[PDB]
Design a binder for this molecule. Structure first.
Ligand SMILES: Nc1cccc(Oc2ccccn2)c1
Ligand SMILES: Nc1cccc(Oc2ccccn2)c1
Lengths: 169, 170
């Protein structure tokens, strides 16, 4: 129904209060790497099968700058990659599928730039490639990560699944 | 290139730029550091005969990322185990005596087919160096696996990390 989500919406999601008990959650701080979803739809995007656009505000005091690395601060590439997986899980919940998310992996990932503590904003762009409903539900997507209008990462074939039991995962 | 195992204190020393020295490869500090010890590192053996690292992370229920990922469904973020793999490829290149600071360059293919729960005892990382490249800058390609208490749970083909004597342009 809704086509954008605020940070307070995402934080509701992290407690289970957006999609409800048993269903997709985002991480809470300090693993949450999205502040807002500025667009989400089941049409458009590079495959015409859905799209998400989300943002993370950067400032110099975010926790990961101090420890990664000392004397050389740079946002962990893995955390920007995670934001993309978490967004694909969110999409699956947003579509109304039951169950909890687990990332299943990726085809090619490329890092070819960085997020410094002087950056203002990271943007994630997700293009849903295919949704699969075979015993369990999953999605395949391509994503990019940009910082202040410059593309810095790409991932082809992000996969995320929903699990109504993770006991055996 | 003569020490073949590293303690947690060696790895914290690396995180401060004090193992390989200033301007050279570092590991993250807590709470981004995802390795407790390197039990084996060599420039021979491994699946390609071109080098190997075996590292460990001890798991207990109080590790920070369990409480926030996720509420009511605690599970070690896959991205952090994947990062460990990249940081170990970085360390390899530092350990080989190359100058410069690490940036991961990506991966060919990543698979998660299990999980680390807060009841787990130990994660092991196995890194098989495939190729080192010296073309103006230096980088390494490697395959890797993440296991928990004996069970393989993640793989990554074609991990790439480079060393950058100037990250300004990156
Ligand atoms: N929804 C979502 C997205 C990314 C990571 C994830 O957690 C994990 C953790 C371990 C194995 C696989 N996925 C869940
Ligand atoms: N040495 C090393 C290993 C893993 C990640 C990394 O950081 C990043 C951060 C942004 C872009 C690329 N690499 C550095």
């Amino acid at each position: 129904k809704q086509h954008a989500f605020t940070r307070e919406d995402l934080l509701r999601c992290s407690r289970g209060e957006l999609f409800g008990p048993g269903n997709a959650q985002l991480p809470a701080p300090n693993m949450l790497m999205i502040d807002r979803i500025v667009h989400i739809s089941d049409v458009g995007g590079k495959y015409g099968k859905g799209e998400l656009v989300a943002e993370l505000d950067i400032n110099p005091d975010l926790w990961f700058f101090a420890c990664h690395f000392e004397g050389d601060p740079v946002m962990p590439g893995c955390l920007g990659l995670d934001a993309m997986w978490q967004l694909v899980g969110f999409y699956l919940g947003w579509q109304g599928n039951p169950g909890r998310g687990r990332a299943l992996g990726s085809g090619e990932v490329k890092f070819f730039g960085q997020v410094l503590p002087t950056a203002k904003k990271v943007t994630y762009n997700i293009h849903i490639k295919r949704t699969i409903n075979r015993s369990l539900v999953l999605a395949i997507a391509d994503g990019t990560v940009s910082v202040d209008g410059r593309e810095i990462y790409s991932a082809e074939g992000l996969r995320v699944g929903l699990f109504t039991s993770t006991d055996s995962f």
